[PDB]
Design a protein around this ligand. Structure first.
Ligand SMILES: *S(=O)(=O)c1ccc(CCN)cc1
Ligand SMILES: *S(=O)(=O)c1ccc(CCN)cc1
Ligand SMILES: *S(=O)(=O)c1ccc(CCN)cc1
Lengths: 697, 697, 144, 35
């Protein structure tokens, strides 16, 4: 019934999410105690206004130097509006805010007054300010006298041939083509670095950046002598940048005065996420050795500012390094990641089917897991300052919760004590577990033998006893499911279903061999892995084999279509969001043409031409080949303004299925995107999917 | 030079102002200390966006039960947007917010989540919600299960005679006349009381209110049995309500179920501002004995809920009661005003030329001044809870500052210790003093003999030595100047002028005899008082008699025009904002017709007719009579959408002066109001006034 | 306008002849109309005095203006009245009708009032004209 | 119909009409200028 489902969705969507956190300065009282404040930002869906609201809250921690004496709240929640980027000064006395109010303003706050405000649109030195996590940044100087950020390059003015002048600008150039960076980066062609002087108010655009690179992720050099940034190559044309870490880039340093850039790394691979030590002596960053896979295990590298020596701190892990580490798969380090002594680095990374926190000593090169053992869970590190870490913890049956802790000295990191700042009420109606699956000998390749994969099973606790099942493979294909709080699986479990999330071979968190095994074998290796997992779960748990459904999106839709085409007598329902149907015709319309070649088993090179063999190989791996054998009812959701996967791919499948009189339902969102992240769109799609699943099962 | 003036205006307007404050719940730590949080709201002008921004800040106080051990800040400032009314629950665990986002929403917050949100426009039970300080309110129940507020009465639907229906509503009633409450209350005709149930979500409009009254300022009765409110009579027609406390009203109580209202006071005078004791046993309110003057000294009255006995706690003070009290002139009591023992009431009131805090014991009836002595200053009380008071303090040379304190036990209120939460940097370039003026024997009336008035003098400290002077009389005429932070006088003093603010006879804070002396003598008593003050100051301080200027607004403009008409060889410049020129023609266009009769010396009665004697008397007291003798350059500012004073009054004076070739400058703001409170309008008017004054002096 | 002026007089001096009345933007008080209209010379010319710029208010002139206004006969009105006003009228300010409305309502006399927020002296807008004409005809047929 | 007009020349080479007088441009005291 729609009413009960709507009530359940309203109840479940009420839980908020944590986005960012920061630490204030230390205060010493007259009695002798010491305390400090923590500022946290939360986001929450709102169905009355159909919007994602953001608010802020503040907590207070009394500590004794190495232990948390007390912790509590310090007021109510205040909802903000218009903030894009914010940053606190190194001394903690001033705050810089970027606001949209539509023009853009940069404001400076101190105590209970707004000291200065600058209308960046009026000066007309650049375009809109970048606010994403790929290029956007906002940095304070060490002297706290200048601000550094990234904006859009200014374009020359243009006018029409037939314009009336009253009784300079180029004529006929108003419709030139400016290439952007792909999905979720509309009208973002060429960024530039901008420096603002607070005292005077003059904005300056730095010179010396190479003409064929896009700069980003910049911070001030030691001594405020220059700026260190990351340059991404955009020649001969730009490729997609979202969820892709295989884009050629380098690390550069440029002086404030007009001068030539200096190279600090190797200009042949991808590098990202540089952070400076508290003592301003060394830098750490992430390097990826190859460019073939869009996501892979990375290396943690260190650079010494004065000796100019580069060393590899953490290297590639083929399969497993011990029993708690499998490699570095996070694409971004925390903004604050160094310890007080500038010797250890703390981060978070996936590990099999969980997410853990790791600490690495840069002097030696050892890795220690801070959250080893236990049943499972998902940890996220928000910040660390003076050995005080702030973390978020969540499980599939528990909404996110906020905790703080103190980093123990070297050699004893396994005994960290956590203090709960905010706790959430668990749901006792969900029970989750992890299954390990070993492929049969037939489904094994010579190069990588002995690999195994995993699945996460969620079921209603205290079941009376035949229940239906919903199978979910992840997209990517180089991604994974982690034991975190997921909304839709929780809703499906609470409404009466059993959810099986599969992490087939080729996922992140299982080693580099797992990543490298998949390419060239799509369409017949993952499909079998999912089928084997489903069969094993059905034969073990003794579920209701007559009611099994599939759900997935993007590559998940690819796998679902393959499954309903090759095994037409197993599933009774299917839901897909923006699936991939024809690889051959997807080349000419997507923003990442290299993905098709890499997945099909060929090397991607610019200035290439279509070949019969390559196109035949691409066509042989598409689910459309199995279209005539489809017998399962299908529901499709498409976003018309999607650039990652063109929406005609689903239309071809829809037309083919409709030409044979098969029950198919189609929904098209005219102004949506690949993510379908709009509140109204997401709610409508989820409600339609749950209604379809309950009606057909 | 305009550039220096603009820089000075920016620097002076950078200062913020304090609007409201509230106290959080008490928290006990494991060590043994006790602390609580304070939430404060500030507002500040912004010239880049030309808007009044509002933000919130939080502070923390550690106390030992009767003394403030420590105090500090607890984070940065966060700017809000859309909030109209807010209120914290009695237990301090939940918060109710009214927001405009354009529809109106009512939200409930608890911890880090928004529990519920209601779209008041969708239910369609009433109109827009009142958010002013005259009728608006928002109250929690004692059980914290219902919310009470005031909205606009719903109007029947209407349609045109010629409307096409597709192949109930009255026809021809879409242009009916609905009378409003006057200035600053556009489209506010008839309010109603609304009760919302949080658990269910149903809104109910209470029944039993008399059909000829408008309800407001409501709160829940003891035991949650009914609602106590104040009803304002609106028959036969509505009079102005802004800055007028002489409107007939009464105190009513009505049961939740359908029932008849019960009267709790006398239905012949004006009553306002009822507050309930913490023990829910007695009520206190303000009563005004007459209806002739728009502002006057009031009475503080008490009502017992169970014995049903009314007594007068604080009575009318004719001239002076001791050396620190002169009567109650505030029009509103603080939201929290009772002490913990439900025996004493704390408020703030003007006293001569300052503003002080007073505590009154309801059992006996004594009044004690908490801030007696000293050089002077302005205090404002924001809240008091469990004997912890929060106050704002300001002087003409010091911006507002925020302090907290503890109320001493009975009989020792003179030894209160203040702890500074927020302090502001003073301006050492301003020196202010107070002058007392005794009128000559000729300018005295038989009924009230021996009255004296005051003036406030601001001058630049360390002057080298002939300086110009600017004279300011206040409007009202029943108002006063207090030694608080004023922006424009500070700017004039810092730019090189000497400012003289006059509190002539008829001002508030000097007794009831001073209030009653003025009516019937306007145009020849007030004018003379100002001339005598100016002459005495010039003869004493030895200023530059050749450069004296005038400035005022509304009744101040009236006095300025009278001064430049009767004494044409004393002043060299004049600036007026929305002046009153012709009393006789102002009757038919203003929203307070009784003001003209009261000031002219006659009694106001409805259904009156124009008489030759009354109109001649009104014409004899107008400055227009002295128009042909005007010789001083004049600058006029007018607001076209003003309802308190029609803008043709200044146009008549402008035409008369222009017909005689006199230098006159006129500025008209098409969409402004009586206050001219818009940021752009205020800035432009102030800059024009300062440029005119500096150019002509 | 002026005709409505006359109409008011006709229901003040002869209160036992007419049973209904409709007026659009009438002139009620000549004395107070001087300071708000765009033709101040009209009041002086109609009242019997010569208009000159840079003039000042005189008691005799103002008394003569007040003696010729229909408001003087307001207490004797007994006929139901329907008023139409345009808020943005500059030829005749709309408070003139409001004074008459308040005086009549203070004595419990059946009066209906319609106010058009964005209309002018002519009331020439199609919707405004149609609504006013329909209301007038309905009032006349109902009361007759 | 009080001031408006539109007239042809006798040679039919010029047009004559009546318009509103141009006002000088104005700006606020606090206006941000391009750098
Ligand atoms: S879709 O969600 O399967 C998909 C496939 C590949 C990419 C590029 C790597 N982030 C993104 C989405
Ligand atoms: S004006 O500012 O002199 C003026 C006069 C009288 C009132 C009514 C009492 N608040 C308001 C403003
Ligand atoms: S009103 O319609 O009676 C009226 C009276 C006088 C004038 C000025 C002369 N056209 C206009 C309208």
């Amino acid at each position: 019934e729609p009413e009960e489902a709507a009530a359940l969705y309203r109840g479940l969507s009420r839980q908020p999410a944590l986005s960012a956190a920061c630490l204030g300065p230390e205060v010493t009282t007259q009695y002798g105690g010491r305390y400090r404040t923590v500022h946290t930002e939360w986001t929450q869906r709102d169905l009355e206004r159909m919007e994602n609201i953001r608010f802020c809250r503040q907590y207070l921690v009394f500590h004794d130097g190495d232990s948390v004496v007390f912790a509590g709240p310090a007021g109510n929640s205040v909802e903000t509006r218009g903030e894009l980027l914010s940053r606190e000064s190194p001394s903690g006395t001033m705050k810089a805010v970027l606001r949209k109010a539509e023009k853009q303003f940069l404001e400076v706050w101190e105590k209970n007054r707004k000291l200065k405000s600058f209308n960046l649109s009026a000066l007309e030195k650049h375009g809109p300010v970048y606010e994403d996590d790929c290029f956007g940044c906002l940095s304070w100087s060490h002297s706290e006298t200048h601000l550094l950020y990234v904006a859009d390059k200014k374009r020359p003015k243009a006018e029409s041939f037939f314009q009336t002048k009253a009784l300079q600008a180029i004529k006929g150039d108003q419709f030139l083509f400016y290439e952007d960076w792909g999905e979720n980066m509309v009208s973002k062609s060429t960024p530039v670095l901008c420096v603002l002087d607070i005292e005077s108010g003059n904005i300056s655009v730095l010179e010396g950046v190479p003409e064929s690179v896009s700069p980003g992720q910049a911070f001030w050099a030691p001594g405020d002598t220059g700026v260190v940034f990351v340059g991404w190559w955009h020649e001969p044309f730009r490729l997609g940048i979202r969820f892709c870490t295989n884009r050629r880039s380098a690390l550069y340093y440029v002086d404030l005065t007009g001068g030539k850039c200096e190279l600090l790394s190797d200009e042949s691979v991808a590098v990202t996420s540089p952070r400076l030590s508290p003592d301003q002596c060394r830098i750490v960053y992430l390097r990826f050795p190859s460019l073939v896979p869009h996501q892979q295990c990375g290396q943690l590298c260190l650079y010494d500012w004065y000796t100019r020596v580069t060393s590899v701190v953490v290297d590639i892990v083929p399969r497993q390094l011990g029993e708690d580490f499998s490699g570095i798969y996070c694409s971004l380090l925390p903004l604050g990641c160094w310890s007080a002594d500038s010797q250890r680095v703390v981060f978070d990374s996936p590990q099999r089917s969980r997410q853990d926190l790791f600490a690495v000593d840069t002097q030696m090169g050892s890795v220690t897991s801070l959250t080893a053992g236990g049943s499972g869970g998902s940890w996220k590190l928000l910040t660390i300052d003076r050995d005080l870490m702030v973390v978020q913890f969540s499980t599939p049956s528990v909404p996110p919760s906020l905790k703080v802790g103190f980093l123990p000295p070297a050699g004893k990191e396994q005994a960290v004590s956590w203090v709960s700042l905010e706790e959430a009420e668990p749901f006792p109606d969900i029970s989750w577990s992890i299954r390990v699956l070993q492929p049969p000998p037939q489904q094994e390749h010579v190069q990588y033998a002995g690999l195994d994969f995993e699945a996460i099973l969620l079921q209603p606790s205290n079941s009376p006893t035949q229940v239906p099942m919903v199978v979910m493979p992840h997209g990517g294909p180089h991604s994974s499911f982690v034991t975190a709080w997921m909304l839709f699986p929780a809703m499906l479990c609470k409404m009466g279903f059993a959810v099986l999330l599969v992490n087939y071979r080729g996922s992140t968190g299982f080693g580099q061999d797992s990543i490298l095994s998949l390419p060239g074998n799509v369409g017949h290796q993952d499909v079998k892995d999912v089928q084997f997992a489903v069969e094993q779960v059905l034969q073990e748990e003794h579920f209701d084999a007559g009611r099994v459904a599939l759900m997935g999106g993007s590559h998940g839709g690819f796998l679902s279509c393959h499954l309903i085409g090759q095994y037409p007598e197993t599933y009774s329902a299917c839901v897909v969001r923006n699936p991939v149907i024809n690889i051959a015709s997807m080349m000419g319309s997507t923003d990442i043409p290299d993905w098709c070649m890499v997945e099909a088993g060929f090397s991607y090179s610019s200035d290439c031409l279509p070949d019969l063999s390559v196109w035949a190989a691409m066509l042989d791996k598409s689910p459309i080949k199995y279209a005539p054998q489809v017998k399962t009812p299908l529901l499709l959701m498409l976003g018309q303004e999607d650039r990652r996967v063109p929406f005609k791919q689903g239309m071809e499948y829809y037309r083919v299925l409709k030409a044979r009189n098969v029950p198919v339902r189609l929904l098209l969102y005219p102004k949506s995107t690949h993510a379908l992240s709009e509140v109204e769109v997401e709610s409508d799609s989820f409600m339609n999917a749950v209604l379809w699943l309950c009606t057909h099962l």
